[PDB]
UniProtKB/Swiss-Prot annotation, chain A:
Keywords: Acetylation, Biological rhythms, Cytoplasm, Disease variant, DNA damage, DNA repair, DNA-binding, Host-virus interaction, Intellectual disability, Isopeptide bond, Nucleus, Phosphoprotein, Repeat, Ubl conjugation, Ubl conjugation pathway. The modification Phosphothreonine is found at T1099. It comes from Homo sapiens (Human). Residues 392-708 are annotated as: WD repeat beta-propeller B. The keyword Nucleotidyltransferase does not apply. The keyword Kinase does not apply. Phosphorylated by ABL1. Ubiquitinated by CUL4A. Subsequently degraded by ubiquitin-dependent proteolysis. The gene is DDB1. This is DNA damage-binding protein 1.
UniProtKB/Swiss-Prot annotation, chain B:
Disulfide bonds: none annotated. This is DDB1- and CUL4-associated factor 8. Interacts with DDB1, CUL4A and CUL4B. Interacts with KPNA1, KPNB1 and XPO1. Belongs to the WD repeat DCAF8 family. It is found in: Nucleus; Cytoplasm. The chain holds residues 153 to 165 of 597 of the full protein. May function as a substrate receptor for CUL4-DDB1 E3 ubiquitin-protein ligase complex. It is linked to Giant axonal neuropathy 2, autosomal dominant: An autosomal dominant peripheral axonal neuropathy characterized by onset of distal sensory impairment with lower extremity muscle weakness and atrophy after the second decade. Clinical features include foot deformities apparent in childhood, and cardiomyopathy in severely affected individuals. Sural nerve biopsy shows giant axonal swelling with neurofilament accumulation.
């Protein structure tokens, strides 16, 4: 029994595919970017991309095409999951509520059929007559496109050729006709088949099988004016037709393989081409005319336009704008100019979108000496390589810290109408008021004339027309910028005390307990206006001139005491509109209004910390959407702030939250602060652009961070990092990198660009002499990286043809020094595997990288961990436990041996080990008997491992090539000379993500138990946690209910998606709860929410809170 | 080889 809960802490950032077309509106341009499982939907603008709709799916997208048949208005979408899920999508707006529909769907796999090289190829014919699929090796799948076929019934046709490389449909062919590059013992060839769907046959294509090159890897079909097939290999480009053939081998393209393409002009004149280098080519075909038939071709030449992130996906948009989909680096928006600049680049970067890319390796490191952890992932590859420092929450830059206990408010102020650098600030004190004027950065408490300092201030804002306002318990006083005394004054015509207050430039609304008054400010005098009484006692008010008026405010709204409500009203007339009745038993503490780009928002905060969101129109004055969140458990004070262009909302609480803007939505995320009571914007000539803060005691000021939950740094390495270690006693990261170099004319290698190891601040190479007995070679490095600066303190280069595989930072035995230990291997392309290698013990000093001790090994050092003052390495297949003499030298002790290829290791504290390559996992014990290994138990399934972590003394988490997670634990039954020997698979699961690395740590803190983060190839960062017996049984069930209520996108069963899947079996998943689906609850309509709960107890609006305490593990 | 495979399995095909 192994109860587990996985969560997506960060969505996959790798673009896996993208397309253009009119999917939103027949007169709209759309960018359709598929991630792994996500599907971003954009519309193109003068700026670039307007986000529109982002949805997940239950599957890895592998095919994504837009198509528009006859008798259809706008383009429809066709998606095919890697688990062979076909489905046809459509975008459908009901005015303001946006929906993606399922027009067709089915499952298009067969029991028979090896999946082939290059994997899935899906293609639609130009006439929309069908959908052709090469799912399987040797067959071709047809989905005959009809008005019927809502379940996409598909017939297969036999293929004589069982190795296809690429296939397209050809324009201008009588029937539907395919075109492809196949392989056989003679080499590579081109062939066409006419696909008649009447007879379910393949007939014969419009032109005879010709011959393409022994590296051909792309068929590009060409549109109506031309017709034909452009075929791309290495070092050559061919154009094929009836008997027309054209070819060119431009030395430029030879250098690296053209990987992805794309048509720029509809008439198929200009095409874009991607490389492993990131080079952006322009394929141009020359128009030739005989003038009475159509148009032929004279030639076709290729020009190098510039440089992109290693393009996996490619799409031209409106005007020059090219979206570059990267997998190994940050995707980006790129402009094609007509003119070159410096270095001859017709390419100009517009925007660069953060891809956390191939996460090869990472670790959890504080770097702030708090309790929270930053994560530092080795991301990217080749020129795109980088470290990413991922920091959870928005943080504060502090400047001054004055110790004042019992502050009650603060508002922006100036003592000169000229400078907008607010040189003053007045705070509310414990029934008192003290002045704070600034000599600059000097905190000065004096008296100010016309301001009372023994009463308690309620408001103190910037009333324009030369005046300073001070509403307090009794009177609302007034000061000017000409005399500075009692310029005017207002008093309640009874001697009753004012309670609630709201004020802007030339407008004031107060409350005397149910009583209301509206004021005005002009030159020098305080003039009163209208008055109305109200149902109960006023708890809060708000007034502010919005985006439709200059200093004066149109409509209005409040919330009062007894009924516990939120009232919509008018201002001068004081009439009552459509209030929103609220539940609860505590007052509403704060109420506000805001404006961003497009929309107006009415927010109300409660006393027990909760918050409700509604939309008050500047015109209509009507309701909007309802939902409940938790913040802290204290009252929440709502303020407005200046940041960038989008100026936003700060929620003060015991758990401080900020409200930015995402796409049109309002962000809602944590703020790294002790506890925050009251807050305001600033801009003094001692602290500009600052935000002011107060709590129990102590003021703070200083600029605010970014937006979002996850902050991302990025330290561009320009090469490719393999693993990372954190020596904290040293205050620096050790990172293994790798650069590719080219054979040169003399006999050595050089470099292609300035990398991290080359332009390193200080370097050293290896001197060991232990070995004897069109060319690219990887060069490897340890890098020393300052944790504060992230500069390259040092870069050590390893030997020739030596790769550095593994890294540890530890103290070994009674050696007081901490070390860097690097496992390595010697690689040359004859041997299938290494039969050599090293183990180097590096020591970093004041600022010096010392080679302390080396050791030879007859095989690759795959991983290694600090066991117990002893070093535990895996050497190709022997797993050996080294110890550390006083000699300062690695001496052997024991070494197991029952492995195929020991790729990974993890240590459970005391004396326990794990992990293999193509035969699942093992479990070992070190015996302080004679320092001898004893194989405790092993998993007997045939998994192709990729990642291993020990969760606890029994739960072992493994990840594997087929994107599946599993969990092992030892059988606790009798007859333990056999049943002990096997450890059973107590939990399977389909993440749908290649897992590179696991480790312990959390991105938060100063309901569950444990915490294990993982990084994946697609850049997704996950979180595994272990569960308590009851919490599972509830969650698995409420997970089962959610399937019935949530309408799947491609109409895909969630339980199917989550099922364990290798080529040779499929099981439904046990012991695994994706909180992703659990988190799906909090974004449900209340009607479909009540459904989930029909049935120790079961509530309704109590689970809404349990799913809260979950979205707080990351 | 075994390693030319292992710096490509950490990246994807």
């Amino acid at each position: 029994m192994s109860y587990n809960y996985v969560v997506t802490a960060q969505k996959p950032t790798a673009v896996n595919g993208c397309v253009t077309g009119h999917f939103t509106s027949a007169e709209d341009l759309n960018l359709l970017i598929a991630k792994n499982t996500r599907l971003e939907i954009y519309v193109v603008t003068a700026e670039g991309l307007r986000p529109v709709k982002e949805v997940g799916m239950y599957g890895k997208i592998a095919v994504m095409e837009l198509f528009r048949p006859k008798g259809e208005s706008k383009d429809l979408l066709f998606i095919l999951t890697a688990k062979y899920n076909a489905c046809i999508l459509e975008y459908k707006q009901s005015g303001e509520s946006i929906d993606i529909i399922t027009r067709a769907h089915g499952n298009v796999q067969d029991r028979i059929g090896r999946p082939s090289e290059t994997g899935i190829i899906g293609i639609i014919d130009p006439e929309c007559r069908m959908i052709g699929l090469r799912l399987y090796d040797g067959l071709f799948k047809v989905i005959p496109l009809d008005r019927d076929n809502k379940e996409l019934k598909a017939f297969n046709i036999r293929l004589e050729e069982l190795h296809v490389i690429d296939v397209k449909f050809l324009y201008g062919c009588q029937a539907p006709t395919i075109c492809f590059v196949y392989q056989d013992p003679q080499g590579r060839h081109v062939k066409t088949y006419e696909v008649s769907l009447r007879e379910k046959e393949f007939n014969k294509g419009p032109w005879k099988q010709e011959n393409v090159e022994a590296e051909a890897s792309m068929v590009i079909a060409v549109p109506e004016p031309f017709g034909g097939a452009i075929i791309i290999g290495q070092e050559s480009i061919t154009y094929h037709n009836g008997d027309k053939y054209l070819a060119i081998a431009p030395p430029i393209i030879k250098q690296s393989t053209i990987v992805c393409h794309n048509r720029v002009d509809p008439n198929g004149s200009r095409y874009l081409l991607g490389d492993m280098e990131g080079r952006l080519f322009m394929l141009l075909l020359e128009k030739e005319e005989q003038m009475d038939g159509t148009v032929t071709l004279k030639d076709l030449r290729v020009e190098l336009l510039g440089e992109t992130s290693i393009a996996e996906c490619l799409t031209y948009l409106d005007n020059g704008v090219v979206f570059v989909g990267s997998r190994l680096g940050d995707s980006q928006l790129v402009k094609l100019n007509v003119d070159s600049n410096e270095q001859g680049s017709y390419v100009v970067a517009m925007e660069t979108f953060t891809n956390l890319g191939p996460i090869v390796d990472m670790c959890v490191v504080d770097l702030e000496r708090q309790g929270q952890g930053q994560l530092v992932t080795c991301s990217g590859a080749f020129k795109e390589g980088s470290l990413r420092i991922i920091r959870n929450g928005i943080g504060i830059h502090e400047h001054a810290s004055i110790d004042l206990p019992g502050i009650k408010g603060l508002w922006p102020l100036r003592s000169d109408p000229n400078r907008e650098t607010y040189d003053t600030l007045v705070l509310s004190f414990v029934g008192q008021t003290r002045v704070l004027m600034l000599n600059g950065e000097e905190v000065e408490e004096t008296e100010l004339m016309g301001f009372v300092d023994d009463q308690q201030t309620f408001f103190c804002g910037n009333v324009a027309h030369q005046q300073l306002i001070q509403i307090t318990s009794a009177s609302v006083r007034l000061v000017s910028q000409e005399p500075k005394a009692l310029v005017s004054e207002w008093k309640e015509p009874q001697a009753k005390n004012i309670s609630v207050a709201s004020c802007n430039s030339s407008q004031v609304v107060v409350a005397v307990g149910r009583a209301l008054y509206y004021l005005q400010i002009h030159p020098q005098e305080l003039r009163q206006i209208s008055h109305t009484e109200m149902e109960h006692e006023v708890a809060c008010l708000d007034i502010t001139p919005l985006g439709d008026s200059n200093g004066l405010s149109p409509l209005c709204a409040i919330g009062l005491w007894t009924d516990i409500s939120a009232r919509i009203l008018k201002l001068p007339s004081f009439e009552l509109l459509h209030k929103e009745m609220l539940g609860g038993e505590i007052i509403p503490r704060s109420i506000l209004m805001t404006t961003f780009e497009s929309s107006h928002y009415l927010l109300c905060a409660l006393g027990d910390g909760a918050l409700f969101y509604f939309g008050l129109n500047i015109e209509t004055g009507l309701l909007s959407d309802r939902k409940k969140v938790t913040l802290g458990t204290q009252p929440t004070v709502l303020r407005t702030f200046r940041s960038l262009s989008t100026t936003n909302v700060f929620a003060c609480s015991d758990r401080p939250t900020v409200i930015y803007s995402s796409n049109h939505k309002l962000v809602f995320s944590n703020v790294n602060l002790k506890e925050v009571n009251y807050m305001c914007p600033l801009n003094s000539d001692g602290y500009p652009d600052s935000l002011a803060l107060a709590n129990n005691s102590t003021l703070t000021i200083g600029t605010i961070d970014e937006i979002q939950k996850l902050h991302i740094r990025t330290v561009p390495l320009y090469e490719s990092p393999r693993k990372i270690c954190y020596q904290e006693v040293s205050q620096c990261f050790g990172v293994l990198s790798s650069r590719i170099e080219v054979q040169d004319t003399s006999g050595g290698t050089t470099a292609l660009r300035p990398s991290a190891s080359t332009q390193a601040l200080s370097s050293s190479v290896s001197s060991s002499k232990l070995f004897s007995s069109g060319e690219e070679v990887e060069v490897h490095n340890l890098l020393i990286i300052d944790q504060h600066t992230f500069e390259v303190l040092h870069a050590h280069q390893f030997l020739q043809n030596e790769y550095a595989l593994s890294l540890v930072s530890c103290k070994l035995g009674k050696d007081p020094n901490t070390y860097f230990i690097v496992g390595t291997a010697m690689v040359y392309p004859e041997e299938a595997e290494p039969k050599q290698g090293r183990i180097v013990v590096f020591q970093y000093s004041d600022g010096k990288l010392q080679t302390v001790a080396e050791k030879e090994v007859k095989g690759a050092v795959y991983s290694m961990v600090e066991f117990n003052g002893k070093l535990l390495a895996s050497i190709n297949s022997t797993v050996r436990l080294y110890e550390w003499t006083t000699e300062k030298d690695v001496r052997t002790e024991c070494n197991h041996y029952n492995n195929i290829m020991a790729l990974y290791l993890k240590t459970k504290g005391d004396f326990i080990l794990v992990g293999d390559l193509m035969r699942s996992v093992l479990l070992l014990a070190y015996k302080p008997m004679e320092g001898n290994f004893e194989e405790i138990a092993r998993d007997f399934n045939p998994n192709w491992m990729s990642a291993v972590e020990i969760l606890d003394d029994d739960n072992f988490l493994g990840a594997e090539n087929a994107f599946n997670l599993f969990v092992c634990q030892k059988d606790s039954a009798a007859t333990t000379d056999e049943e002990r020997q096997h450890l059973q698979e107590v939990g399977l699961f389909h993440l749908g993500e290649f897992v590179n690395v696991f480790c312990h740590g959390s991105l938060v803190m100063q309901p569950t138990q444990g915490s294990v983060l993982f990084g994946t190839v697609n850049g997704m960062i996950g979180l595994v946690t272990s569960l308590s017996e009851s919490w599972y049984n509830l969650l698995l069930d409420m997970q089962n209910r959610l399937n019935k209520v949530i309408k799947s996108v491609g109409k895909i069963e969630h339980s199917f998606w989550r099922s364990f899947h290798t080529e040779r079996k499929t099981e439904p998943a046990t012991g695994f709860i994706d909180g992703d689906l659990i988190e799906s609850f909090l974004d449900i309509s209340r009607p479909k929410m009540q459904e989930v709960v029909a049935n120790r107890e079961a509530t309704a609006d109590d689970l809404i809170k349990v799913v809260e305490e979950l979205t707080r593990i990351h | 080889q075994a390693l030319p495979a292992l710096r490509e399995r950490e990246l994807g095909s």
